[PDB]
Design a binder for this molecule. Structure first.
Ligand SMILES: [Ca+2]
Ligand SMILES: [Ca+2]
Ligand SMILES: [Ca+2]
Ligand SMILES: [Ca+2]
Length: 151
């Protein structure tokens, strides 16, 4: 865990602020139900099993609960709500082989061959319009994100 190292005391101060209002019972350590309360306020509904794993990854002391050093590791990994967005940003690169920041019909052809999902020169040009709104034949992060949100 190198998280406190990548931050300043200015930010670590803000993290003990973010720890104190997070810890409802006021014991100075965040349990599964306490995780479950504050994360549920952000539009999430996690089970005791999930919050347990959120602990087990960051729990270098192995007690079954979060302390301040564990939190600088934990909340940093949660600061990306649906962090799989970065995985689809990676998918945007694999789709953009020429690596210019927008997808074309011939670009969907050359990625679908590697995916094992080979689509016709027509079929790929259809996907361009299924995700992109403006009809330029080009798919950038703004219009691309539509198909990733639709699923
Ligand atoms: Ca507590
Ligand atoms: Ca712990
Ligand atoms: Ca491209
Ligand atoms: Ca477009």
């Amino acid at each position: 865990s190198l998280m406190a190292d990548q931050l300043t005391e200015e930010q670590i101060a803000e993290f003990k602020e973010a720890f104190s209002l997070f810890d409802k019972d006021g014991d100075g350590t965040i349990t599964t139900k306490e995780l479950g309360t504050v994360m549920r306020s952000l539009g999430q509904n996690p089970t005791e099993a999930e919050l347990q794993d959120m602990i087990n990854e960051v729990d270098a002391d192995g007690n079954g609960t979060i302390d301040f050093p564990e939190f600088l590791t934990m909340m940093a990994r949660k600061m990306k709500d649906t962090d799989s967005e970065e995985e689809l940003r990676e998918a945007f690169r694999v789709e953009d082989k020429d690596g210019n920041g927008y997808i074309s019909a011939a670009e969907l052809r050359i990625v679908m061959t590697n995916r094992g999902e080979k689509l016709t020169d027509e079929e790929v040009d259809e996907m361009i319009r299924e995700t992109d709104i403006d009809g330029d034949g080009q798919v950038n992060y703004e219009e691309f994100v539509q198909r990733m949100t639709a699923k």
